[PDB]
Amino acid sequence: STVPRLHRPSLQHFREQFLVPGRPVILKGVADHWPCMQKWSLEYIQEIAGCRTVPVEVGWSQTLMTVNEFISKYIVNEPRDVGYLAQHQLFDQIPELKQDISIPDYCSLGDGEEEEITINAWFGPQGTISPLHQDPQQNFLVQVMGRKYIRLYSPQESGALYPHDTHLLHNTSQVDVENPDLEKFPKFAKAPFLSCILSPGEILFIPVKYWHYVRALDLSFSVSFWWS
Ligand SMILES: O=C(O)CC[C@@H](O)C(=O)O
Ligand SMILES: [Mn+2]
């Protein structure tokens, strides 16, 4: 089934129908006119951030390079491998970029402090994949550039997703969502899910502990807000 799209729902409607029961939704008309949506070209990113060091996931290895090197090696030049500037607090590192985003007003429905909201950048070429995993906070995933295919499985379905047994990976499924090994993981086939293609200006609410799998369909930039 599809994730529902709602235009600027009230705080109360969002709280009652989505946050408290733990149901995903796409919020429209919320982030669509943030400055990032028109300002963040590759060239702008190079101008503001190009000389700064970022962590880059390659493949599986973790390396460090400048933003300029990342763009040259993994985005613009026929790249040899997939590289992803994933899960990085770029906005703490480069505070000028905070001017181009906002914290969604819905985060004020949580029990946590605004100071403790973690804002991560996710910037990479077409074809980056984040395997199916769950996170311990609520998330608003804001799509700025490009589109992502997203699959969502409820925490009720965790038995059918065969989480890894190691503590480093217990929040991650052993299954490759788009090419599952049903001989090894047969319960996966019948597990229900939601999916969407998340486009620029749209926000995906991923409830706490909802399993999510993400594949970039174009050159992509997303901003996540982890909150409670
Ligand atoms: O966009 C991605 O590739 C994954 C993002 C996601 O896991 C998150 O927690 O925001
Ligand atoms: Mn995540």
UniProtKB/Swiss-Prot annotation:
Fe cation binds at residues 133, 135, 212. Induction: Up-regulated upon starvation, DNA replication stress, UV treatment and by camptothecin and etoposide treatment. Changing residue 57 to A: Loss of L-arginyl 3-hydroxylase activity toward RPS6. Keywords: Aminopeptidase, Biological rhythms, Cell cycle, Chromatin regulator, Chromosome, Dioxygenase, Hydrolase, Iron, Metal-binding, Nucleus, Oxidoreductase, Protease, Transcription, Transcription regulation. It catalyses: L-arginyl-[protein] + 2-oxoglutarate + O2 = (3R)-3-hydroxy-L-arginyl-[protein] + succinate + CO2. It is found in: Nucleus; Chromosome. Changing residue 122 to A: Loss of L-arginyl 3-hydroxylase activity toward RPS6. Changing residue 212 to A: Loss of peptidase activity toward methylated histones. GO terms for molecular function: aminopeptidase activity; chromatin binding; endopeptidase activity; histone H3K36 demethylase activity; metal ion binding; p53 binding; peptidyl-arginine 3-dioxygenase activity. One of its GO terms (cellular component) is chromosome. 2-oxoglutarate binds at residues 84, 130, 133, 139, 148, 212, 226. A protein binds at residues 57, 87, 130. Changing residue 135 to A: Loss of peptidase activity toward methylated histones. Its cofactor is Fe(2+). Binds 1 Fe(2+) ion per subunit. Can form homodimers (via JmjC domain). Found in a complex with RCCD1. Interacts (via N-terminus) with RCCD1 (via N-terminus); this interaction stimulates H3K36me3 and H3K36me2 demethylation. Interacts (via JmjC domain) with H3C1. Interacts with FBXL3 and PSMD2. Interacts with CRY1 in a FBXL3-dependent manner. This is Bifunctional peptidase and arginyl-hydroxylase JMJD5. It comes from Homo sapiens (Human). The chain holds residues 183 to 416 of 416 of the full protein.
